[PDB]
Amino acid sequence: EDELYRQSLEIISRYLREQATGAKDTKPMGRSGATSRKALETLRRVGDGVQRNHETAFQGMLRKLDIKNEDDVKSLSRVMIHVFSDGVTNWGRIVTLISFGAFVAKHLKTINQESCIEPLAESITDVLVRTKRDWLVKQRGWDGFVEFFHV
Numbered sequence: 001e002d003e004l005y006r007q008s009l010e011i012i013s014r015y016l017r018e019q020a021t022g023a024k025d026t027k028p029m030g031r032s033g034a035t036s037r038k039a040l041e042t043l044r045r046v047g048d049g050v051q052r053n054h055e056t057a058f059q060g061m062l063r064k065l066d067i068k069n070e071d072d073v074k075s076l077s078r079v080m081i082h083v084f085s086d087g088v089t090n091w092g093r094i095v096t097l098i099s100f101g102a103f104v105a106k107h108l109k110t111i112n113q114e115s116c117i118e119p120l121a122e123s124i125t126d127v128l129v130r131t132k133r134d135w136l137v138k139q140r141g142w143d144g145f146v147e148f149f150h151v
């Protein structure tokens, strides 16, 4: 089974859901739990910082995207491919990708479209894993992510 995909989705989905609801998911992690847990703490530390350091730009992009419903949520995939995939890859850009995703997740809860959060996480995961697998594998996937941002 695609273990990198399954782990990426669990990490991305949990962070987005946690950001939108303000509550942690106490369910156990699936495979590679130890790493996923550390990846999630890393995201809470760096991801949260990103949303604040670039709050104005994030607010601006969100406005441009004008997300009001599911169709708008589905249009985000083309934009992620355009902006994220078509560029040099580094952990910072992957953190921005996921961090803005969490920014969007919070928005979805403000407009009572919370059911779109998991489909959004799936879309982010597709872009990340399906267009940057080689890079991710070379950088040791999530173990590498945790090591890169190690305190």
Ligand SMILES: O=C(O)c1ccc2c(c1)N(CC1CCC1)C[C@@]1(CCCc3cc(Cl)ccc31)CO2
Pocket (backbone or CB within 6 Å): 057, 058, 061, 076, 079, 080, 083, 084, 092, 093, 094, 096, 097, 098, 100, 101, 104, 120, 124
């Ligand atoms: O600058 C970078 O290194 C960079 C790297 C990645 C990245 C972005 C910028 N952007 C653009 C920025 C401007 C403020 C947010 C958000 C992005 C595009 C817009 C749709 C979208 C939708 C979702 Cl759910 C998540 C990410 C994205 C694509 O992920």
